[PDB]
């Protein structure tokens, strides 16, 4: 569990701050979760273009939603980063320049994963292999649980020894992404983007999302470096929640409202 965000402490340190940082997950966070129903209403866009017209601020959304849509919806809000398909298109603030991370990346990892995937493929009646230009994929829905396993520590002593890549379960599935596609690995790099210099470290940094995977966020920032006082790290949720944010906020609606305090800072 969490205490309720601290509004008045958020206020004061963001007041104080020289340089601010926002992550924001989009689906559950910027806007309630629904059954391409979730478009940004007004009132969500008119916030953030208010936030990233600061110029001490860098802003940044963070979604898997597919390019197009942040693209669509947002793109016309030049100071803000965004990130989406999972870390896979990335747009800098103020840049027009939407880069494809997978093609800067070595992906020569993909043939030892598909080696180790064929391994067990031939040995687990009923799964399969799934290739994508970014993950690779071991399907094993149709012993499965047991064989993932074994799977995961052949991955571990060899492709993933040498290669920056990480290695995520499904539901009845084993995946094999570049560590670029993890959110933890996407806030990290924003904070070290700055440098290493103390003085030229952001003085706020305002993270926020609600599911396991932004979970990955808040752990990354406790390996920050940044003075507790200046980090915000918020999940979207229960009062009851386990987390690794030191915060929450109950609805997205009070995600919005807090941001138009700071707005109104
Ligand atoms: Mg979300």
């Given at each position: 569990?969490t205490?309720?965000?601290?509004?008045?402490?958020?206020?004061?340190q963001?007041?104080?701050?020289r340089?601010?940082?926002?992550?924001?997950?989009?689906?559950?966070?910027?806007?309630?979760?629904?059954?391409?129903?979730?478009?940004?209403?007004?009132?969500?866009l008119?916030?953030?273009?208010?936030?990233?017209?600061?110029?001490?601020?860098?802003?940044?959304?963070?979604?898997?939603?597919?390019?197009?849509?942040?693209?669509?919806?947002?793109?016309?809000?030049?100071?803000?980063?965004?990130?989406?398909?999972?870390?896979?298109?990335?747009?800098?603030?103020?840049?027009?320049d939407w880069?494809?991370?997978?093609?800067?990346?070595?992906?020569?990892?993909?043939?030892?994963?598909?080696?180790?995937?064929?391994?067990?493929?031939?040995?687990?009646?009923?799964?399969?292999?799934?290739?994508?230009?970014?993950?690779?994929?071991?399907?094993?829905?149709?012993?499965?649980?047991?064989?993932?396993?074994?799977?995961?520590?052949?991955?571990?002593?060899?492709?993933?020894?040498?290669?920056?890549?990480?290695?995520?379960?499904?539901?009845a599935?084993?995946?094999?992404?570049?560590?670029?596609?993890?959110?933890?690995?996407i806030?990290?790099?924003?904070?070290?983007?700055?440098?290493?210099?103390?003085?030229?470290?952001?003085?706020?940094?305002?993270?926020?999302?609600?599911?396991?995977?932004?979970?990955?966020?808040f752990?990354?920032?406790?390996?920050?470096?940044?003075?507790?006082?200046?980090?915000?790290?918020?999940?979207?949720?229960?009062?009851?929640?386990?987390?690794?944010?030191?915060?929450?906020?109950?609805?997205?609606?009070?995600?919005?409202?807090?941001?138009?305090?700071?707005?109104?800072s």
């Amino acid at each position: 569990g969490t205490p309720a965000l601290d509004r008045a402490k958020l206020l004061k340190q963001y007041r104080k701050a020289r340089k601010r940082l926002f992550m924001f997950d989009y689906d559950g966070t910027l806007t309630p979760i629904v059954k391409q129903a979730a478009i940004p209403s007004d009132r969500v866009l008119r916030t953030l273009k208010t936030l990233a017209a600061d110029p001490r601020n860098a802003v940044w959304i963070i979604s898997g939603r597919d390019q197009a849509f942040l693209d669509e919806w947002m793109g016309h809000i030049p100071e803000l980063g965004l990130s989406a398909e999972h870390g896979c298109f990335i747009r800098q603030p103020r840049s027009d320049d939407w880069e494809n991370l997978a093609e800067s990346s070595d992906m020569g990892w993909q043939k030892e994963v598909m080696e180790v995937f064929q391994h067990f493929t031939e040995r687990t009646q009923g799964s399969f292999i799934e290739r994508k230009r970014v993950a690779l994929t071991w399907h094993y829905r149709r012993y499965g649980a047991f064989q993932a396993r074994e799977c995961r520590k052949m991955l571990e002593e060899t492709v993933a020894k040498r290669w920056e890549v990480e290695v995520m379960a499904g539901k009845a599935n084993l995946e094999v992404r570049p560590t670029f596609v993890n959110k933890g690995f996407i806030a990290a790099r924003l904070v070290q983007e700055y440098g290493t210099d103390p003085a030229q470290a952001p003085e706020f940094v305002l993270c926020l999302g609600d599911d396991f995977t932004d979970e990955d966020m808040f752990r990354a920032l406790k390996k920050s470096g940044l003075p507790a006082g200046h980090v915000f790290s918020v999940t979207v949720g229960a009062s009851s929640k386990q987390t690794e944010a030191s915060w929450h906020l109950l609805e997205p609606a009070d995600v919005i409202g807090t941001i138009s305090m700071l707005n109104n800072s």
